[PDB]
Ligand binder design. Structure first.
Ligand SMILES: O=c1ccn([C@H]2C[C@H](O)[C@@H](COP(=O)(O)O)O2)c(=O)[nH]1
Ligand SMILES: O=c1ccn([C@H]2C[C@H](O)[C@@H](COP(=O)(O)O)O2)c(=O)[nH]1
Ligand SMILES: O=c1ccn([C@H]2C[C@H](O)[C@@H](COP(=O)(O)O)O2)c(=O)[nH]1
Lengths: 143, 141, 148
């Protein structure tokens, strides 16, 4: 099996990540993840904090995962790309998930809290079975 | 085994995709796909229809795949990138493939139908064994 | 197991890649890789040679790998992206590894030889066990019977 573990680490993040076990019955490859707060993306590089700590596991072992833009991220009203193409998250990383987004236009772009600009893909592109939303301040499960 | 299934939608796409079975003797990871139409990429974002329906399978079961730019897509004369970095195609997706291409230059760029700007990589990067080009008016296996 | 093999080509690449076997105790997915030469990235597309020969193997067989930008490659001061998003390296490729880097800014950007702008990831995202830095005068492995 392949499972994700997402823990909100701020107040605004808790509103979008209440404790739950989410099943991927549609069997999509990506796990959508929220902005959790309104933000304005200036032209050029923007550092976006996702306000979550994430773990991925495959066959009982902690693995890495990848951050990929959703197709909806770039539109005619927002010329947005992920600076690093895809974000490579190593299994040893236990910090907060971050995004480097380049606004390629000359116009600042308003992003809303509920929007999901990116999705998480497990190492090896394995379909996630469950997305476990952990409680804030809890210790992550052992793998 | 890992196999791709490509079905042309338009008459022009059928010209570039006649029914056949292509073998991946070189053992390449990506499956180059034609644009299947001449097109002009305006500066900024461009929505490009590939005029094909694609399914990927791994060990008898339908799987997802990924759309990746080819090295030749970007040159000194055309600054083209895929807007989403790589396209993530879920196994449940059954519609026509599409590309979001950003022309970073200030002048329109002409692309020919025979050009392969992008390649398809199976979920998990499994190397394809066969690329099945299907007839236009049939249903997927 | 999954292992990478790196052989420097130029003199300065040899200075950055002396013979050694690097173990991936952190179990990181990416293998950081040096520029091996000072370079100036002009606005627009830049074709960059990595000055190394690279192979990846998985369960005794040669496999492909992927070139991914590191998070450190793009900063507020240098707007650098990989033109193809990620570089897909087929196992047959054996030639020298190339980069297509777009400088999105209006002024040239200086990169130092010691900087690691990109990282290599094995086919299927398998975590590498060892990273073998080969001498310039030793045989590069083929991982297969000599074909045809
Ligand atoms: O888009 C990204 C890329 C990386 N990281 C974190 C997780 C990685 O383990 C660590 C190192 O990333 P790189 O330097 O290898 O890109 O930074 C992110 O939070 N977001
Ligand atoms: O480049 C792309 C990316 C996605 N899709 C289709 C297939 C996916 O299943 C669906 C959703 O993609 P995301 O929103 O997850 O990127 O859109 C494309 O046609 N082209
Ligand atoms: O960033 C890249 C991408 C590709 N290649 C080489 C290795 C591949 O086997 C070959 C074909 O690449 P594509 O045309 O499939 O992108 O070019 C590189 O050196 N660097």
């Amino acid at each position: 099996a392949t499972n994700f573990f997402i823990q909100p680490i701020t107040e605004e993040a808790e509103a979008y990540y209440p404790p739950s076990v989410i099943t991927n019955k549609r069997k999509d490859l990506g796990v959508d993840v929220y902005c959790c707060s309104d933000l304005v993306l200036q032209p050029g590089l923007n550092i976006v904090r996702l306000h979550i700590k994430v773990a991925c596991e495959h066959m009982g072992k902690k693995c890495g995962f990848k951050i990929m833009a959703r197709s909806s991220m770039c539109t005619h009203e927002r010329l947005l790309i992920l600076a690093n193409g895809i974000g490579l998250i190593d299994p040893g990383y236990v910090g907060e998930l971050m995004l480097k987004i380049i606004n390629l236009g000359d116009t600042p772009v308003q992003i809303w809290a509920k929007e999901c600009l990116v999705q998480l893909v497990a190492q090896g592109d394995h379909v996630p079975d469950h997305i476990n939303i952990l409680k804030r301040n809890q210790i992550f499960p052992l793998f």
